[PDB]
Amino acid sequence: GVVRQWSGYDPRTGTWRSSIAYGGG
Numbered sequence: 001g002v003v004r005q006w007s008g009y010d011p012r013t014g015t016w017r018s019s020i021a022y023g024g025g
Contacts, residue, residue, distance in 0.1 A: 004020065005020055
């Protein structure tokens with residue numbers, strides 16, 4: 001698992017993309 005976020009946050013679904021741990025982070 002990873003431990004770094006970025007601009008891959010989807011507001012439309014309040015979730016991340018996939019590369020990073022979706023659901024908060």
